[PDB]
Amino acid sequence: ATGRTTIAIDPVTRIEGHLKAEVVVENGKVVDARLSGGMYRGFETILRGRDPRDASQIVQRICGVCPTAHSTASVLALDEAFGAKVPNNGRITRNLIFGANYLQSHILHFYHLSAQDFVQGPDTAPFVPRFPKSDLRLSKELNKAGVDQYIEALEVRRICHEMVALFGGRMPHVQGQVVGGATEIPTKEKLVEYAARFKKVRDFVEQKYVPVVYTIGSKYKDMFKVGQGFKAALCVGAFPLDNSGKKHLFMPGVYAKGKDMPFDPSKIKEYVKYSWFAEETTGLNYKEGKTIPAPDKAGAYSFVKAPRYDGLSLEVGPLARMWVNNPELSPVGKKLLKDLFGISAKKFRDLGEEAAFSLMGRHVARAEETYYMLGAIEGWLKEIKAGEDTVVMPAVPASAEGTGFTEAPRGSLLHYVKVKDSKIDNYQIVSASLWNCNPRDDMGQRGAVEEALIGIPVDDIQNPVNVARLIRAFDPXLSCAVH
């Protein structure tokens, strides 16, 4: 048996943003963890005093990987506050703009962020140097397939951004979503252009990406046995499928302690004992949220606040959404689960709680979700009406409030705005990687990733590769988490 080694990793690379992870290893396993989000900008104070319509541009600069998610949450919050009634065709157009970035983001995450955890790249920077014992298990052929797909995926993710820009104007940082809808009516010609790009993305997802995740996973079966954490998840709903506000591609729900429960947003509170914010601001629901930085506060270790749902520490993201909603698995997933794993499965939960809530399970969920999104986009391409108006032009209210709820590629996102004297009085963001990558709450309960690190194997303290492998399975974005 071995004793303790304490390992600090700053920067954690092949994520978005600024993260330090510190783990305590005893006898070959992580026994404690602390995550530190290291960069703060303070959008919630920058936004104050502005014309509320500016928010749907300003807030995207929280993150240039998921800006369409922030755009969406912001315009939904503004729609509610302004009483803007988005035309049906604008609802669909928004779904086409945002849906295309789910494809971009998941492909970016698996190939350009995560795949080097399992694949040795070409012998030049930024693929070397790396840990001398990186635990890269793939055959020469399968490793080369991984590199070839990494390279192809650079073009595929770029094509996804062309899809976003067709009706979104440009990407990163769309111009095409505003309060009241979408700024550009889709034309027949541009819908052909979107569909032609979408077909190429679909073929890559179906033929390369989903199969490679199961295939690599089958060489790392041990990675389905670690990373469970609390086995607790959150989904707030996303992609409205009609104009009622009640039907969504991903429906809301909470899962914790083995039980499904409804989602009530009034049960969200953000704690700050272990966060660099003034102690008087602890425990606030977002409708009363406050952002008062305290970078010298003793005992704190992160610029991420600690959100809790009725006291529960929950995770968010593809696993959360796919677990809560339990869709049918992809045809190739069903086949490869049988052929490579001996698993008979029809729906996502047939993986079982332990394997789903695991390091490799989160990669599988993300690939499955990418396939699921293809069918949603196909549906929207059949439902959209070329030439039909997509926007209304609402007057700015003097006094109002609104909340926008959606699912960013990494998990649940909400924006809350309060307007007073026709200007932003408060704006509060509760984002996906906030739920995943937060520090302890005021009672000392760890954040989701902190808890999922417990039990991670570190058989070689000189090459502790599984620490960051676990972190990357959650697709962290610390710029989103801190804002």
Binding site: I9, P11, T45, G64, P126, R157, G169, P172
Partner: protein, 283 residues
């Protein structure tokens, strides 16, 4: 390019950025990002994409920086916050010491061949320096000057920049250096920067004076809803008149759209962005 050609070392440091300047670069069409990474530059440190991590990644950058002292390119994405002794942006930890963005720029800035301030945050402060902020977010050139660091700075702004502005500025610099050496080449680059540090091939022309809707502007024919694509966008908030960029011709994302066609220009390449360009949706 060729896989076996000369490729200068680049370190890419993120301060108060959003990673959008990195993502926009990933969207380069010609040359593709694969070709940039394998044939044009050697990206030795970049936290979003590099293989190694933590103190080992920092030490790798330090070893390359010593070997190529005076000769590496330093890209900065995001602003540099000076308040609270730099604590609003920590970029790494090595030798049991945290490394702030302030520390990192003081360490590597003096030893770079040139600093490329990519994006409006790095070039001019941008959103992190806007009204309501409290981190002391500072533009690269100002931070370096305040600290006596004389290394040349080239600004490639935008929020985000177009990939062609980033790659094209790199290509222009590398060509000047091939013809004239490092000092002579950087002198030739500086000669083609405007008063805001921006390369004139990309930022030397005004959007509005080259806009396809200029006739409508001059006739006073203004769209009243975003989806009316016939009229000028001025009353909807377009900041084209005060913006120097080539978007009207280059467009975005493989030429599929641009901000004025789709909605409005928000003036994202300008030193006063965002506050001097706000409100975005009124003239």
């Amino acid at each position: 390019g060729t896989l076996t050609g000369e490729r200068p070392p680049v370190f890419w440091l993120q301060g108060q950025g959003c990673t959008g300047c990195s993502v926009t670069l990933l969207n380069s069409v010609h040359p593709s990002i694969a070709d940039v990474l394998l044939k044009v530059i050697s990206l030795e440190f970049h936290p979003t994409v590099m293989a190694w991590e933590g103190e080992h990644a920092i030490e790798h950058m330090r070893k390359v920086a010593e070997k190529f002292k005076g000769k590496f390119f330093l890209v900065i994405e995001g602003s540099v916050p000076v308040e609270a002794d730099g604590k609003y942006c920590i970029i790494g930890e090595a030798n049991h010491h945290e490394i702030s963005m302030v520390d990192a720029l003081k360490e590597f800035g003096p030893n770079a061949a040139a600093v490329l301030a990519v994006g409006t945050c790095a070039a001019y402060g941008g959103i992190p320096a806007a009204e309501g902020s409290e981190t002391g977010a500072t533009a690269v050139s100002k931070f370096l000057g305040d600290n006596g660091i004389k290394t040349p700075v080239v600004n490639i702004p935008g929020c985000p920049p177009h990939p062609d502005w980033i790659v094209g500025t790199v290509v222009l610099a590398l060509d000047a250096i091939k013809k004239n050496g490092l000092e002579g080449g950087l002198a030739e680059v500086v000669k083609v920067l405007d008063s805001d540090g921006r390369p004139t091939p990309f930022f030397g022309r005004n959007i509005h004076e080259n806009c396809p809707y200029l006739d409508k502007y001059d006739e006073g024919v203004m769209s009243a809803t975003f989806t009316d694509k016939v009229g000028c966008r001025y009353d909807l908030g377009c900041k084209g008149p005060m913006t120097m960029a080539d978007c009207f011709e280059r467009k975005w994302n493989g030429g599929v759209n641009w901000c004025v066609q789709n909605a409005v220009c928000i003036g994202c390449v300008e030193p006063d962005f965002p506050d001097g360009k706000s409100p975005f949706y009124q003239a």
